[PDB]
Design a protein around this nucleic acid. Structure first.
Lengths: 169, 124, 102, 50, 121, 54
RNA sequence: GCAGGUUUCCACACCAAACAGCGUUGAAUGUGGGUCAACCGACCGUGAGCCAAGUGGUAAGUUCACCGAACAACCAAAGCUGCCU
RNA sequence: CUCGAUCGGCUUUCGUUGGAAUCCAGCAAACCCUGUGGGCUAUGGAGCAGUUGGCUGUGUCUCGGUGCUUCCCAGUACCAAGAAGAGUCCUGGAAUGGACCCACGAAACAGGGAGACUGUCCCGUAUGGCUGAACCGUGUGCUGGGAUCACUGGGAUGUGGCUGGCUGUAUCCCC
RNA sequence: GUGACCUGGCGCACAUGGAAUGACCCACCGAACUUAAGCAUAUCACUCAGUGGAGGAACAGCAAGCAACCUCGAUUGCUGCAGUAAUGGCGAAUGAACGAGCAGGACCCACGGCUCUUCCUGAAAAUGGGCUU
RNA sequence: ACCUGUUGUGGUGGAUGUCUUGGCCCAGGUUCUGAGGAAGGACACAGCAGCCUUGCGAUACGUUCGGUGAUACGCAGAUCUUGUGAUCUGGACAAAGGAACAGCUUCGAACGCAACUGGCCAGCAAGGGGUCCCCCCGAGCUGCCUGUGCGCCAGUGUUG
């Protein structure tokens, strides 16, 4: 078909992918990539300004090992902490954890003590780096909060912790 | 993306110039003030108006002077006190003169005209 | 559900259920809700039916029987080419994507 | 023939009214205007569908 | 001497209908002159008198709609053209009260757990 | 859309003249023409010199 | 006088714009007029036929089905009349 | 009619706040018991027993602040947008062209118009001003100080309510 | 004593529905030219045409899921897996998904990723209701 | 004279060059119609107007009001000027005041029934006019499906 040695074509374009006069086409051109980069950045900083004195991402995610045998050693972020990790950290109310900015995942359990201890100490360094503002602005004020932590609420860009992969690495 | 309204598009700008209404042609047909007026009111340019004096400063009638008697905003023209021209027959007609050529020698000074002068004169 | 929803155009079709079946016909009962009734609009639990996006769920396959015949009973590996739609899925994996740099 | 509908008669009257040449003063409108009436029918040339 | 809306707004209906009658009689005379062709000062007055009639009728109808809004202000089942003129979708729109309706469990949980302000040092 | 009765009353109101009869055309263009025959006591000429037809 | 035409009807001006396989003329061009109904007809129904309704069919709209006072149905279609009030 | 809550691209929507003038009801409006409504929501729950916490009109007498208006004193501001149509001369129908010594702006040399080729001819641009909307100057506005008013935090102590966690049970939980 | 329910009807009042929209969307229905150097399964294509219904998005969506791991943890979109596994006169051709990396996980939705029904409670959630004000 | 040619010139013709209130393309935002009558279609409406107008509807190239502030213009013609004020402009469109919000023939989903009919000179009827009656004009109500409520009912359905 070639009069040569080129491989067997295997082209896979038999089904009107081309936007001609008769067809609408199956083509999507990503010319918006450039503008959408800036737009995503702008809406991300608008999210920050909206939920200002809080992490820009906002919930503390756990660290879970990637799934298969190929990615066993690679760690990453989860969806939320297990209620066992919460109870070990000192939190027995999932809804209160969520309201103060710790993410919960009742679907997850700890299949081992290492994940439990790791995410427990993660939550415990949280809740100490954490400055809770008091409700109604002048009532009780928690421990550690020094009355100028409320004067200077700083929005950090990344959550204090190291990279997620830096736990398998 | 450039923000809205401040666009240097030739086609859009020319469309705007050639489809402007009369209240926009009033400000497109603005003229420069003499130095007397400019020092007196601390304002540099105004929209030209009927009943005020101009000096032509350009064109085949440069150095001539006279009171404006017609703003023909449809043609972007301005007719002047005595810049006339005979037709084929003896009928004298007016010559349109784009007000960018003329400078302004006097004003009529209506109430809104004086208020405009004051508002543009207060330096900020 | 479709026949009842086309006959009663100003109502909203929530679930139906088999009530009877003989040699000639199968009989179903369809629950419909009047979206412009004060009781409906007041009770939050059904208040979502009064939004303009909920018109003709029977016509669009949003009801339970629709979700059934659209393959949406199952999820995971038994509803592979089902979500978010069969045609949406087909489009999404028959799309020719031309990035700026390729 | 004589037999008509009121609708047909109103339409034929509007066509009679349209069948008119441009006013003389229209060409002089500064921004160069129409010279002649390009929408002008004649009973012989083109027939109304109606 | 033509009709000015601010000058006839102060008048009252019986004094305004007489003006409208004079105006319609004058416009009829202008329409007769248009046939028994007279002067341009009489053929161009047609549209003046016609806009005058238009604005007299406008003042009348506006005053009437105003007093009717005064009347049916508090009443329910107002006339359809006195009800607020929104598009059909937002006439049929679910109210904000009803959207913000919540179940008692929703209210009790939203009470027992308010979203709190907090930052990380 | 004026009826002959509408035309009768309108004529008697505009110019207080009793119409003996009204006949009506719709002329080709689309206008409606009306002949208003006055009672013998009335005089269309003595009415026209008022109306302005002369 | 029908259907069709739709102002071609009439008058004046006009043929040095063009058309009429001529051009002091015309169905041309320009202007302005003209069509009056209790008695002539549509309109009133009915015929062949059709529509809605009623009901049914379809994944579903339909130029989907039925028109059944000779003749249908799965059908609660007599809203009118006399007296009393 | 008030009273409250909700809405503002607005002129509302809702409420078992209460009141008046009234009409149905009369074992007591009408749907509804062929079930409206509440509790739980499966990495948990409910009951029961006990503890440890917090939200809320709080009755009551304390203290401070913020301000809705008003009054004084004092200061500031109220919006536009620069620079040669330069003295001249020449060509030209018309200078934005050319020549002579000297000129200037630029946070503005993006554009477009103008009798030809312009940064300094016009609109504009950059910048500025607003966006409590007022874009306004014998009228205002803002700030600061002071005062009256308008409004909401910190302590009494009966509450009215609530509500989270924890321990135990003998009790059980029907998707 | 001439009722109480149930089930149907007619009229009225107050309301929804109807129709439209060269892009996107949802549900159906649905070809053939073409390719296979013929042609019939295959291909074009679960596309064009046709019907119905929208919204500012629609659809999907906090597991009767992925995986077999040191597990993960709504859905969606992108990168990639991958022209692979697999289907196919095993011919022409067709052909995913998960892992993994991201965007998102603020907001006009949320019981801050759930809830109805089941189950527990239960004198309808308690000082009648209506029209004007 | 005719023909062929070459120049000059004049015609027929509209190529070229230059531009452009136009298109096409990409990115961003919105999607905001309708029984309170949509989209479309008619017939009307201008002193001189035929067409066009995302002009307009018997208030008919426009009405109220706001912003602007001396034009508009192809002719004329009276209104208009330190001003209730020409023109242009703003969804009949700003007012933060629940102050203010006009009008819109006719077919059309098209709605009393029809319609190749402006028919039935429809039924009911507020009102206006000509003379208690009667006569003419006549706003407005009368569409279907579905939902709820009210009124009247139907049933050898169950009962009392």
């Amino acid at each position: 078909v070639k009069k040569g040695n080129a491989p067997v074509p295997n082209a896979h374009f038999h089904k009107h992918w081309n936007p001609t006069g008769s067809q609408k086409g199956h083509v999507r051109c990503f010319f918006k990539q450039g503008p959408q980069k800036k737009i995503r950045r702008a809406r991300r900083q608008k999210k920050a300004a909206a939920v200002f004195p809080r992490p820009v991402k906002g919930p503390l995610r756990p660290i879970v090992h990637c799934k298969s045998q190929r990615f066993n050693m690679k760690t990453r972020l989860g969806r939320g902490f297990t209620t066992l990790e919460l109870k070990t950290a000192g939190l027995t109310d999932r809804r209160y954890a969520r309201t103060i900015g710790i993410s919960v995942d009742r679907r997850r359990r700890n299949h081992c003590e290492e994940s439990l201890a790791l995410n427990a100490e993660r939550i415990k360094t949280y809740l100490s780096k954490l400055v809770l503002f008091p409700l109604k602005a002048g009532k009780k004020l928690p421990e550690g909060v020094t009355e100028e932590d409320i004067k200077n609420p700083v929005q950090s860009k990344q959550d204090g912790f190291p990279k997620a992969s830096s736990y398998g690495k | 993306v450039n923000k809205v309204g401040k666009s240097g598009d030739r086609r859009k700008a020319r469309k705007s110039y050639f489809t402007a209404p009369s209240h926009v042609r009033r400000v497109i047909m603005s003229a420069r003030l003499s130095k007397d007026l400019r020092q007196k009111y601390k304002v540099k340019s105004l929209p030209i108006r009927k009943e005020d004096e101009v000096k032509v400063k350009r064109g085949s009638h440069k150095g001539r002077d006279g009171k404006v008697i017609a703003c023909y905003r449809l043609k972007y023209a301005v007719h002047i006190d005595k810049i006339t021209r005979e037709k084929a027959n003896g009928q004298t007609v007016q010559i349109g003169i784009h007000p960018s050529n003329v400078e302004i020698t006097k004003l009529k000074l209506d109430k809104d005209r004086k208020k405009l002068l004051e508002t543009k004169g207060r330096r900020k | 559900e479709g026949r009842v929803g086309k006959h009663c155009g100003g109502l909203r079709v929530l679930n139906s259920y088999w009530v009877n079946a003989d040699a000639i016909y199968k009989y179903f009962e369809v629950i419909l809700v009047d979206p412009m009734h004060k009781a409906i609009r007041s009770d939050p639990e059904i208040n979502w039916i009064c939004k303009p996006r909920q018109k003709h769920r029977e016509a669009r396959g949003v009801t339970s029987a629709g979700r059934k015949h659209r393959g949406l009973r199952h999820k995971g590996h038994r509803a592979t080419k089902a979500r978010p739609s069969v045609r949406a899925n087909w489009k999404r994996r028959n799309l020719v994507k031309f990035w700026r740099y390729r | 023939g004589a037999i008509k509908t009121l609708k047909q008669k109103l339409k034929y009257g509007k066509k009679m009214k349209q069948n008119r040449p441009i006013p003389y003063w229209v060409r002089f409108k500064t921004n160069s205007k129409q010279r002649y009436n390009e929408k002008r029918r004649h009973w012989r040339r083109t027939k109304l569908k109606m | 001497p033509k009709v000015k809306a601010h000058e006839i707004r102060q008048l009252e209906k019986k004094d305004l209908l007489k003006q409208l009658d004079d105006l319609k009689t004058e416009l009829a005379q202008l329409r007769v002159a248009k046939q028994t062709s007279g002067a341009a000062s009489k053929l161009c007055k047609i549209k003046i008198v016609r806009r005058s009639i238009a604005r007299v009728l406008t003042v009348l109808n506006m005053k009437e709609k105003n007093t009717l809004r005064k009347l049916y202000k508090n009443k329910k089942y107002k006339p359809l053209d006195l009800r607020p003129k929104k598009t059909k979708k937002e006439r049929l729109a679910l109210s904000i009260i009803d959207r913000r309706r919540k179940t008692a469990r929703q209210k009790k949980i939203l009470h027992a757990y308010p979203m709190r302000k907090y930052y990380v040092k | 859309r004026a009826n002959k009765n509408q035309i009768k009353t309108a004529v008697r109101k505009m110019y207080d003249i009793k119409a003996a009869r009204v006949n009506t055309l719709i002329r080709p263009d689309g206008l409606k023409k009306a002949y208003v025959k006055l009672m013998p006591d009335n005089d269309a000429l003595d009415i026209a010199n008022k109306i302005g037809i002369l």
